[PDB]
Structures are given as structure tokens and as C-alpha cells.
Amino acid sequence: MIWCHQCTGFGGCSHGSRCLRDSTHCVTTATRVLSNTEDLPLVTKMCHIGCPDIPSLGLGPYVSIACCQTSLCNHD
Predict the structure, then answer these.
(1) DSSP tag of 57
(2) Can you list the GO cellular component terms from the UniProt entry?
(3) Under DSSP, is residue 73 helix (H, G, I), strand (E, B) or coil?
(4) CA–CA distance, 56 with 27 (Å, rounded to integer)
(5) Which of the two ends of the chain, N or C, has the fewest CB atoms closer than 10 A to its terminal CB?
(6) CATH classification of the domain holding 22
(7) How many Cβ atoms from other residues are within 10 Å of residue 13's Cβ?
């Protein structure tokens, strides 16, 4: 278990939060949303025991997933 960013997005905000006792990795999903009118791309960050995939967060494709085995490895 480690600390990472669990922010919603709206450009790629930040928020150091404690991950799950089981989750020892961080995930970064940078993609658009279902909204037909947006000013910036959505960036949902979270933690997991590896590097899963959930393109359902948007329209499916055009989805990018960047995971890593490092605390708060979602920085810039």
C-alpha cells in the first residue's frame, strides 16, 4: 500500500490520498468524457494492484492508461 493521486480530473488536478491496503500501485487515465462540450480532457487517477483498464469512463477508444509501481507516480 502506498500514497498516490486520486483526483477526478478537469485538466489533471492533484490530490495525494491513501490508496487501498491491497493496491500498491497508481493509475492515470487521461481521456475525454461523454460530454459533448468540454474545455479540457478528463484525467481520473486512482490506485490498483497493477494496471487495469476501464475505457467505459468515456466512449471506449482514445483512452490512455499510465500505471507505475511508485508512490504518487502520477505527477508531471
Answers:
(1) G
(2) extracellular space; plasma membrane; synapse
(3) coil
(4) 15
(5) C
(6) 2.10.60.10
(7) 11
Q: How far apart are CA 33 and CA 42, in angstroms?
A: 6
3-state secondary structure of 64: strand
Q: Contact at 8 Å (CB) between 48 and 67?
A: yes
Specify the number of domains making up the chain. 1
**What is the rounded CA–CA span in Å between residue 3 and residue 16?**
6
For residues 6 and 27, give the distance between their C-alpha atoms in angstroms, rounded to a whole number.
Answer: 9
For the purposes of burial, counting CB atoms within 10 Å of the CB of 21, is it exposed (0-12), middle (13-18) or buried (19 or more)? exposed
Q: How far apart are CA 41 and CA 30, in angstroms?
A: 7
Helices (H), 1-76: none
Q: Whole domain around residue 16: which residue ranges?
A: 1-76
- DSSP label at 56? G
